[PDB]
Specification:
Chain B: Its EC number is 2.5.1.60. The complex is a heterodimer of chains A (324) and B (312). Chain A is mainly α. Chain A is 46% helix and 0% strand. Chain A is built from 14 helices and no strands. Chain B has helices at 3-28, 34-44, 51-64, 70-90, 95-106, 113-126, 131-143, 148-161, 166-179, 187-203, 208-220, 229-248, 253-266, 272-285, 290-309. In chain B, helix 1 runs antiparallel to helix 2 (34-44), helix 10 runs antiparallel to helix 11 and helix 14 (272-285) packs antiparallel against helix 15. The chains are: A mainly alpha (324), B mainly alpha (312). Bound molecules: the ligand COc1ccc(S(=O)(=O)N2Cc3cc(-c4ccc(C=O)o4)ccc3N(Cc3cncn3C)C[C@H]2Cc2ccc(O)cc2)cc1, calcium ion and zinc ion.
Chain lengths: 324, 312
Amino acid sequence: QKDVTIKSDAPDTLLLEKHADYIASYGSDYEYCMSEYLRMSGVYWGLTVMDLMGQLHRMNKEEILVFIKSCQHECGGVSASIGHDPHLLYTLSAVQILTLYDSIHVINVDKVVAYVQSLQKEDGSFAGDIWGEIDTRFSFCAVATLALLGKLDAINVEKAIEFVLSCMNFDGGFGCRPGSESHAGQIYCCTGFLAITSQLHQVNSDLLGWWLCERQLPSGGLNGRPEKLPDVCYSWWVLASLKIIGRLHWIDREKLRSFILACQDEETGGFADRPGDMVDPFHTLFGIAGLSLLGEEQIKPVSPVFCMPEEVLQRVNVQPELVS
Amino acid sequence: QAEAKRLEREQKLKLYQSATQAVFQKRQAGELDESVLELTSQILGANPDFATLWNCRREVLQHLETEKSPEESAALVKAELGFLESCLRVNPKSYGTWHHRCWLLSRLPEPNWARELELCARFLEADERNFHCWDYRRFVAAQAAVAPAEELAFTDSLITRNFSNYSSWHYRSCLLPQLHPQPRLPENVLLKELELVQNAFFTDPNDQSAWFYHRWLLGAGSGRCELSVEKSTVLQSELESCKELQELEPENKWCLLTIILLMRALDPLLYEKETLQYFSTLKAVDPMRAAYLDDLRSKFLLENSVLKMEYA
Ligand SMILES: COc1ccc(S(=O)(=O)N2Cc3cc(-c4ccc(C=O)o4)ccc3N(Cc3cncn3C)C[C@H]2Cc2ccc(O)cc2)cc1
Ligand SMILES: [Ca+2]
Ligand SMILES: [Zn+2]
C-alpha cells in the first residue's frame, strides 16, 4: 500500500556520462563537510561506481592512497577521516579501495588483521569498535575485510557462523542481533557473510527469497521491510541478497529497472533514494550496482557479495560460490 | 525565503566547523572535561551519526568519574540521560544514540530499568516499527530479567490497539519458543496463535504482517499425517474463511496464497486440482511474483510426485 507513484515524465534512459561527471566533480559545499564522519566510505562509493562505469582513472589514486595511510591508527583499524576514530565500517571501505587500486600494502595489513581479530567476542559476534556495539553488519565487515586480505582464518570462523545463524528469524531473514526483526540491510550483510564462509546451505532460500521478493512494490522499486517506502539502495541490498541465494528472477526485473532509472537526476546527474529527490554518491553507487546485477550492458559486472567489480575479485581470487 | 535559509547554512556550518575543530583541539590536548560535553552537545543533536563525538563523550565521562565524587558522577549520568532523551526526540533512528544509552546504563551501579522499559513504551507509541527501540527494549528486558510472559502480554495489547504490527508479531515469534523451551511449538499454543493471527487478518486483510506470521505458524507444528481432529477442523475452518474473504477482496493475493498453503497443510493430493486453479488466479492477481509462484508450484508438484510413488 505505501508506495511512490512514478511521474509519467521521469527518466527512462541510462545517463552514464552524467553520473561519471557527477562523482568526478563531487567534493569541490554544505553536505560534504557534514559527512566528514563517513568520508572513507564516501570515497569507496565514488571509486567503486566510477570503476563500474569504466571511469576510475578520472579519480585521484595517489591522493587517496595518502589519505588511507593517514587514516590508519596504531591499533591497526582505519577511521573515516583524519582525526576520527577507527571502525570496522571504514576499515572495510579502506580495504575495498586498496583492492580496487591493487595497493593493499599502502597500509599495515598485519595490524588490520589483528584489529579485526580483537573485536570478536566469546559468542562469535563482532563489535564495531572498542565501544562494543554488536551488529551482524560488523560480522560482515570483519569477514569481508579478512577475505579480501586472504586472512579469514585469523578469526574464530565457526563461532562467527554460529552467531549469525542465531540471528536468523522466523521469516528466513536476519537482524542486528539475536531477537532482531528482519531488515534488508542485515540480510545483505548476513547472506554475504554466509557466502564468504561457505554456509549458504544453512539459509532457507525459498522462504527468505519470498520475503525478499515481496519487497518489490507496485512502482517497481524495493523497500527494506514491510510497509516502508521503496528506495534505490534497498533495491541493491535486496537484489544482491537474492543473487547470493539464487533467486534474482523472483523480482520483476523490468519494473525494478524503470524505478532505478526514474531515480536519476537528468540535470545534476547521480541517483537519489526515490524519484525526484536530491541525489548523492551512496544511492548513485547502489542504483548503478543494481542495474548491473539486472544485466545492464554499459556497466561492469558487480560482485553481489563485496559490491565491487567482478574483475577486481577475479584478479585477487576471492570469489565465493553463491546458491545458483 | 530565498537566500535567507541557504545563507545561514554557511553560518550553521561555521559553528559546527569551529566546535568540531575545538573538540579535536581539546581532545589532542588531553582536556577531558565539561567543555567537550558542551561542544559535543551542540553537534550531536543535529548530527547523531557523528560517531567519533559519542566516543569523546565517553572518554570524558569515563575520565571525569575518576576525579569527581559518587554524587557528582551521579549528576553527570542523570544529565547524560536527559541529553540522550532529547537527541532521540529529534532523531530516533540513529545507531549511535541508542548504543550510547546502552553503554551508559550497562555501567551504572543501580540502573532504573522500569523507567527505561517505559521510555520504550513511549517511543513505540510514536513509531511501533522502530527497530532500534525494539532492540533496546529486548536489552532492557534481559538486563532486568523480565519474563517472556510480560513481553508476550505487551505484544498482545500492541497488536489489537493498531496495525503496523510486523515488529510485534516478530517479537512474538521469539517469545513463544522461550515459553516452551525445546532443544517446534506445542499444539495448544499453536492453536491460540492461529486464532489470534486469524482475527488480525480478517480485521485488516491488507496487512501483510499477519499473513507472514501465519505462514510460519503453518509450518511450526507436527505434520499433515499427525493432524489432530481439532487442528484438521480449525485448518479446514481457516480454508473456508479465506474463500469467503476472497469473495469480498478478490484482488487480495495474501489470502489466495494462504488458501494454497492451507490445502498443502491439509492434504496435498486431495486438493491437487484446487491447488492448480489457485496458482493461476494468484499469478493473475500478483504478476510480479509470477516467477516465485511457478517455482513454488514446481516444488509442490515434485512433493506430490514423491507422495504418489510412496503408494504401495
Ligand atoms: C542524510 O541523512 C543521513 C542519515 C544516515 C547516514 S549514515 O552515515 O549513518 N549511513 C550512510 C548514508 C549515507 C548518505 C550519504 C549522504 C551523503 C553521502 C555521500 O558521501 O552519503 C545518506 C544516507 C545514508 N544512510 C541512511 C539512508 C539511506 N537510505 C535511506 N536511509 C534512511 C545509510 C546509513 C547506514 C550505512 C550504510 C552503509 C554504509 O557503508 C555505512 C552506513 C547518512 C546520512
Ligand atoms: Ca587519475
Ligand atoms: Zn537509501
